[PDB]
A paper describes a structure:
The botulinum neurotoxins (BoNT) are potent bacterial toxins produced mainly by toxigenic Clostridium botulinum species. The holotoxins are expressed as single-chain proteins that need to be proteolytically activated into a functional di-chain form, which consists of a ~50 kDa light chain (LC) linked by a single disulphide bond to the ~100 kDa heavy chain (HC). Although they all share a common modular architecture based on the three functional domains necessary for their activity, namely the binding (HC) and translocation domains (HN), which form HC and the catalytic (LC) domain, they present distinctive properties. Serotypes A, B and E are the main BoNT associated with human botulism. These neurotoxins specifically target presynaptic motoneurons via a dual-receptor binding mechanism, which involves membrane-anchored gangliosides and a protein receptor.
Complete movies were collected on a Titan Krios microscope, resulting in EM maps at 3.6 and 3.7Å average resolution for BoNT/B and BoNT/E, respectively, although local resolution varied significantly. Here, BoNT/B also presents a linear arrangement of its three domains, whereas the BoNT/E map shows it retained its more compact domain organisation, thus alleviating reservation that this singular domain organisation among BoNTs may have been experimental artefacts. Our structures are of inactive variants of the toxins presenting dual mutations at the catalytic site (BoNT/B1 E231Q/H234Y and BoNT/E1 E213Q/H216Y). A similar set of mutations (i.e., HQxxY) in BoNT/A was previously shown to prevent binding of the catalytic Zn2+ ion, which is also not visible in either of the two maps presented here. In the cryo-EM map of BoNT/B, the belt is well-ordered except for a small surface-exposed α-helix (residues 487–495), whereas in BoNT/E, a section could not be modelled due to the lack of map for residues 499–515, which forms a random coil in the crystal structure. For BoNT/B, the lack of density in some areas, particularly the HCC subdomain, suggests that the preferred particle orientation observed in the angular distribution map is the main reason affecting map quality and resolution, although local dynamism of the domain cannot be excluded. Since HC/B has been well defined by X-ray crystallography, it was fully included in the deposited coordinates associated with the map. Although the crystal structures of BoNT/B and BoNT/E were used to produce the cryo-EM models some differences were observed when comparing the output from both methods, with direct superposition showing root mean square deviations of 1.9 Å (over 1218 paired residues) and 2.0 Å (over 1197 paired residues) for types B and E, respectively. For example, overall superposition with BoNT/B results in a nearly perfect overlap of the translocation domains, whilst the core secondary structure of LC appears shifted by approximately 1.5 Å, with some of the larger loops deviating more significantly.
Residue numbers in the entry: 1 to 1291
Write the structure that this text describes.
């Protein structure tokens, strides 16, 4: 039969059957009875204020509190009269009907009703049903008081009292005697409950978006009749007796900003559900499991031993034995002897522990609840009337589809309903506050902070170290890993407990001994003063807030001034924003000023890709340090620089000390002489090692989740608060500016505040989205980088020791006992090689962590191993792992990451790596990318060109590795194989073809090998490929040393720019992006790729013609174009074109010619390109009003016209990187429109000597298409390459 609610009023006469006057167990024998109603059998409601342990004066509000976590509300005038008691009882009936509606409520019930507590705790022999114990029975009055008093015994399972002296507090107390509890040792007892239906908690969410664009009423409130099932699941645990006590999670209190909280056991963590039960280590899980199993076996022994009761003759035997067997799910043998089935007990334990939880109940009932135990909270709000059927419907609840609210959880939104659910005045709320004040005796600055805002950091005393126990293993031992996931189909298969037997009656004899212990509660002070000077969130969020009674303010960027003056506020935005906000305008431009300041606020709050630079950083929020200052004072300096040089470890202000004990070795002393069972022991040892790997990973994950995410969530909450405060301050300032003036401007220009409020809220929402994404990525990066390697090191050492021990054992015993051994030698040599990969999907289930972990792992810029970059005249790895580099300050290098390597031993770079990261078993898969410049041959050393072999990059550690060699016109990549053979990759440049653009030029090279193929990229394309299909099984273990390692001529020096080695697959669509990112630059390029320089000798080169230059004759000053020649010296071995030809285009200025001062780079600079010929000065001239066609520029004598603007402009006209420039001679400065397009014209120049047929490159309207469609300009007369002279190139 389904559970049935009995409906009746409060003034009904005492029937002594359904409305009795019992005595609560904690009342002992005082003699003050209480009326009590029953809803369902063994579920007694008793409406009255809980007064067992509290003083009568305790109820009124005082300066004290009870517990240091929750915020409390006092009220003495609750449940005063019969009307209030009747309303309480009606609300209880309504809530129970709401619970009974859904099938899951019926499953939760019918389980705390049919579960009868065992008769008698351990202080009784194994053959007695000692009914006279305070944890079983209570006494009820039969006769009307005054002449005759009788007491009869009545059973119970749950007694629901009223609220305590604090309405918010709800608890489920149990019964225990002489400091020993029968509710934990598999027995169970009657339990009480405290409750109040009206008041409910108010929570909030961050990731999601609120329905309304307002923060006056924000968040949600918890639905009544769902707080109740939390207490009922606690009651079910206590009643079934599995409320085992074990290691708590103590909050650390060794610092001045730590949270103070009472210890919390696993009972409060196993029922809240979600990701919280994952901070409970599997060792503690198995310990609890074993304790529960042992207790149940003990009760099996007691139940099989008991045979007669000597207290109440009315009690039967066989029916009670059958009922207890049904309750505990035992197995009855044909001889009447009970037992325990391991699978049945495991199923029961999982169903009772993981099967029911608050998150699952909320998801089933479609009710909004919090995300985790460690989360935000808000002051509570009451409900005006829970009985009015227009507000709360027992079929749906707060989400009535009639009023169009069953969507997006609209029913429980505080802002949208806003009318039927009053708030609670803060004139009676008492909270635990901490007063943080400066070291000075009287600073005038003493800040208050709630205890609910500080950082919660766990302590290392709360994590067990069962890994270090010496383990004995034999062929009969298999260890089962207990899961932490509940399939909801268990209850479906159970199907409403059809097989349960009807419970026996509740009429037994009365009790005699009623001695039982009762708790005593005491108040605490609510003020705690500490002296601190380390500025943090608690010191910035207060300075960002202005007093309520002030009217006019003015933002400023001085935190010291913000603390000193209450008039000003602190703003971490830009100085232009501060100036705009401080500006004062007139009535004419008020609307324009308002729009401008709102747009500026939105743009300033929306920033995600600041300082787009070649560096490998995806996203960053550049005002977190300026707004919060969390860590080692990240506010000062550059947050971007600090992040890029310190990794993700700079935000946190307390680095946890990990607990990674060394795991104990195995004791495989089974000593089986025959029956070849040693293989079973070996396999069991391997499985046990796997389980220990899993346990260590779980421990690391639990500690991470307990500390790091908590601190980062506090950071995110502070960010939300700061942004909201800034928006509110801006709106208040705008309102004051509007209100300052008289009615004239109000009538002339009209504006409403709702539009600007909505715009500001939208901006805040977008900014919070970006900040949340950044913080989540940072947290996952820290987890994957700074914690796992230590664990994998410890497990690798343990694996080595275990392999040695197993090898010694097998050699000493089994090698002689059994001939066949090579199979298990191969097993112990191969299986113990590969490590178990990490995977968060096994140790966590909720999508919030998994999705961002997957995104981080899919990201390609988070897989750097050996990020080599220049930073402060030193080489520091930017990968974040931390590698030791040995260099001195004597050497001098350019800032833009330039390395020069030669045969001299003076230049020495030593790198020691932390190659203990999760290893790559397959290997044969990586990439190496770098930028090279190589010298040129000087027609000397044919042996050097042909025979010589040299290299600068190598990895030779265990006589098998890989290296990259460079020859004269060759690129080689050699890898070694354990067998003896070697595979090599060859590439070369054509030099007899007379076409070359790589020689003495920067060139990007990438080598990428996978299991299938090894590929070479030099320009983003494939030219030469060869197969590496052979399985090499050679892994790079040692260091890589950068040196030629050969004493040769000093004339050779190799230039290197950017070394990056990836252990990740780089197949395609990433190499080209890397090329573009690392080659993109604002400045201009030389012939080879160096920055364009001033006062540098230059010569003409264009891709249109291979032989053209400008030369001025030594005898006579005439400049013109002649054809180029080859090298004058004859050399049949090799030949090349001539380069050091023509006249220089030096930028010589008489005012500043030597020691030019550092200037400021500006786009489209005004540069004059004129050269000097000894004492003759030339002038570049063009006839302003030219009427001819194809007219050359004039090299004229000196003219006294310099104030006129005949400047030359330089730019680019192609998207992809190149080595060329675009020159322009703009005669009119304000020519905002295009004067003309490109024109290549065949021209018969009117030369006196001869009519030269040239291809002149002028501004003509005959080739509009090229520079109108704007492709990548590679071939044109608009190249104008500037080729300097340097000692690297020998004439």
């Amino acid at each position: 039969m389904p559970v049935t609610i009995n409906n009746f009023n409060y003034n009904d006469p005492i029937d002594n059957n359904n409305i009795i006057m019992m005595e609560p167990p904690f009342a002992r024998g005082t003699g003050r009875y209480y009326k009590a109603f029953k809803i369902t059998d063994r579920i007694w409601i008793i409406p009255e204020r809980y007064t067992f342990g509290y003083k009568p004066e305790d109820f009124n509000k005082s300066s004290g509190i009870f517990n240091r976590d929750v915020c409390e509300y006092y009220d003495p005038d609750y449940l005063n009269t019969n009307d209030k008691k009747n309303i309480f009882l009606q609300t209880m009936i309504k809530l129970f009907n709401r619970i009974k509606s859904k099938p899951l409520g019926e499953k939760l019930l019918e389980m705390i009703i049919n579960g009868i507590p065992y008769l008698g705790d351990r202080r009784v022999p194994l053959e007695e049903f000692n009914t006279n114990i305070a944890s079983v029975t209570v006494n009820k009055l039969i006769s009307n008081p005054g002449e005759v008093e009788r007491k009869k015994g009545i059973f119970a399972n749950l007694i629901i009292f009223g609220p305590g002296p604090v309405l918010n507090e709800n608890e489920t107390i149990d019964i225990g005697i002489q400091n020993h509890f029968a509710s934990r040792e598999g027995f169970g007892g009657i339990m009480q409950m405290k409750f109040c239906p009206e008041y409910v908690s108010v929570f909030n969410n961050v990731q999601e978006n609120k329905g309304a664009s307002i923060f006056n009423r924000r968040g949600y409130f918890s639905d009544p009749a769902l707080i109740l099932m939390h207490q009922l699941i606690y009651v079910l645990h206590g009643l079934y007796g599995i409320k085992v006590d074990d290691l708590p999670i103590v909050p650390n209190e060794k610092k001045f900003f730590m949270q103070s909280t009472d210890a919390i056991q696993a009972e409060e963590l196993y029922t809240f559900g979600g990701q919280d039960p994952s901070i409970i280590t599997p060792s503690t899980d198995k310990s609890i499991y074993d304790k529960v199993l042992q207790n149940f076996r003990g009760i099996v022994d007691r139940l099989n031993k008991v045979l007669v009761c000597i207290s109440d003759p009315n009690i039967n035997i066989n029916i009670y034995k059958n009922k207890f067997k049904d309750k505990y799910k035992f197995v009855e043998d044909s001889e009447g002897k009970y037992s325990i089935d391991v699978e049945s007990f495991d199923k029961l334990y999982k169903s009772l522990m993981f099967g029911f939880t608050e998150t699952n109940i909320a998801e089933n009932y479609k009710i909004k609840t919090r995300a985790s135990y460690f989360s935000d909270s808000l002051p509570p709000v009451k409900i005006k009337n829970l009985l009015d059927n227009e507000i709360y419907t027992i079929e749906e609840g707060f989400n009535i589809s009639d009023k169009d609210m069953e969507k997006e959880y609209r029913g429980q939104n505080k802002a949208i309903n806003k009318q039927a659910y009053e708030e609670i005045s803060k004139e009676h709320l008492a909270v635990y506050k901490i007063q943080m004040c400066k070291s000075v005796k009287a600073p005038g600055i003493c800040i208050d902070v709630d205890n609910e805002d500080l950082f919660f950091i766990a302590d290392k005393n709360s994590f067990s170290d069962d890994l270090s126990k010496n383990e004995r293993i034999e062929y009969n031992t298999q260890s089962n890993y207990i899961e932490n996931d509940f399939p909801i189909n268990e209850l479906i298969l159970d199907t409403d407990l059809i097989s349960k037997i009807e419970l026996p009656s509740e009429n037994t004899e009365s009790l005699t001994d009623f001695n039982v212990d009762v708790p005593v509660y005491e108040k605490q002070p609510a003020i705690k003063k500490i002296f601190t000077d380390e500025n943090t969130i608690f010191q910035y969020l207060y300075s960002q807030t202005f007093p309520l009674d002030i009217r006019d303010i003015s933002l400023t960027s001085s935190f010291d001034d913000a603390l000193l003056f209450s008039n000003k506020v602190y703003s971490f935005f830009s100085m232009d924003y501060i100036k705009t906000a401080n500006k004062v305008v007139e009535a004419g431009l008020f609307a324009g000023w308002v729009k401008q300041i709102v747009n500026d606020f939105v743009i300033e709050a929306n920033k995600s890709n600041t300082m787009d630079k070649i560096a490998d950083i995806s996203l960053i929020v550049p005002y977190i340090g300026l707004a919060l200052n969390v860590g080692n004072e990240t506010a000062k300096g550059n947050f971007e620089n600090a992040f890029e040089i310190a990794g993700a470890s700079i935000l946190l202000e307390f680095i946890p000390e990990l607990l990674i004990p060394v795991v104990g070795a195995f004791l495989l002393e089974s000593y089986i002489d025959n029956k070849n069972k040693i293989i079973k022991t070996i396999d069991n040892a391997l499985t046990k090692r796997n389980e220990k790997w899993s346990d260590m990973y779980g421990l690391i994950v639990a500690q991470w989740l307990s500390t790091v995410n908590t601190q980062f969530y506090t950071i995110k909450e502070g960010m939300y608060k700061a942004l909201n405060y800034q928006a509110q301050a801006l709106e208040e300032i705008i309102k004051y500016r509007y209100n300052i003036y008289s009615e004239k401007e109000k009538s002339n220009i009209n504006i409403d505040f709702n539009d600007i409020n909505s715009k500001l809220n939208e901006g805040i929402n977008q900014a919070i989205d970006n900040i949340n994404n950044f913080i989540n990525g940072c947290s996952v990066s820290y987890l994957m980088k700074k914690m796992i390697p230590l664990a994998v090191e410890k497990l690798l050492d343990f694996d080595n020791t275990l392999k040695k021990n197993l090898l010694n054992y097998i050699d000493e015993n089994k090698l002689y006992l059994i001939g066949s051994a090579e199979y298990e030698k191969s097993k112990v040599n191969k299986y113990l090689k590969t490590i178990m990969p990490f995977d968060l999907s096994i140790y966590t289930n909720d999508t919030i962590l998994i999705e961002m972990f997957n995104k981080y792992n899919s990201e390609i810029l988070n897989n750097i191993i050996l990020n080599l970059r220049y930073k402060d005249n030193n080489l520091i790895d930017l990968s974040g792992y931390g590698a030791k580099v040995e260099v001195y300050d004597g050497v001098e290098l350019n800032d833009k990451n330039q390395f020069k390597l030669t045969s001299s031993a003076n230049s020495k770079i030593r790198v020691t790596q932390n190659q203990n990261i999760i290893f790559n078993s397959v290997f044969l898969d990586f990439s190496v990318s770098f930028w090279i410049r190589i010298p040129k041959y000087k027609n000397d050393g044919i042996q050097n060109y042909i025979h010589n072999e040299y290299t600068i990059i190598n990895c030779m550690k265990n006589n098998s590795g890989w290296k990259i060699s460079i020859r004269g016109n060759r690129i080689i990549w050699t890898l070694i194989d354990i067998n003896g053979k070697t595979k090599s990759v060859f590439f070369e440049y054509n030099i007899r073809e007379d076409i070359s653009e790589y020689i003495n030029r920067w060139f990007f090279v990438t080598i990428t090998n996978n299991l299938n193929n090894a590929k070479i990229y030099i320009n983003g394309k494939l030219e030469s490929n060869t197969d590496i299909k052979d399985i090499r099984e050679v892994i790079a273990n040692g260091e890589i040393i950068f040196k030629l390692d050969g004493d040769i001529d000093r004339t050779q020096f190799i230039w290197m720019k950017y070394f990056s080695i990836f252990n990740t697959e780089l197949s395609q669509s990433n190499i080209e992006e890397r090329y573009k990112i690392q080659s993109y630059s604002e400045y201009l390029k030389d012939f080879w790729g160096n920055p364009l320089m001033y006062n540098k000798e230059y010569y003409m080169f264009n891709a249109g013609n291979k032989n053209s230059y400008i030369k001025l004759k030594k005898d006579s000053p005439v400049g013109e174009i002649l054809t180029r020649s080859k090298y004058n010296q004859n050399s049949k071995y090799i030949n090349y074109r001539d380069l050091y030809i023509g006249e220089k285009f030096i930028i010589r200025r008489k005012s500043n010619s030597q020691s030019i001062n550092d200037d400021i780079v500006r786009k489209e600079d005004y540069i004059y390109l004129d050269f000097f010929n000894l004492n003759q000065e030339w002038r570049v001239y063009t006839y302003k009003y030219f009427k001819k066609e194809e007219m050359k520029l004039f090299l004229a004598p000196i003219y006294d016209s310099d104030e006129f603007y005949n400047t030359i402009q330089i730019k680019e006209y192609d998207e992809q990187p190149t080595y060329s420039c675009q020159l322009l001679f703009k005669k009119d400065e304000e020519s905002t429109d295009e004067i003309g397009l490109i024109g290549i014209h065949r021209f018969y120049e009117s030369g006196i000597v001869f009519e030269e047929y040239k291809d002149y490159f002028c501004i003509s309207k005959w080739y509009l298409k090229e520079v109108k469609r704007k492709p990548y300009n590679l071939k044109l007369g608009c190249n104008w390459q500037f080729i300097p002279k340097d000692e690297g190139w020998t004439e």
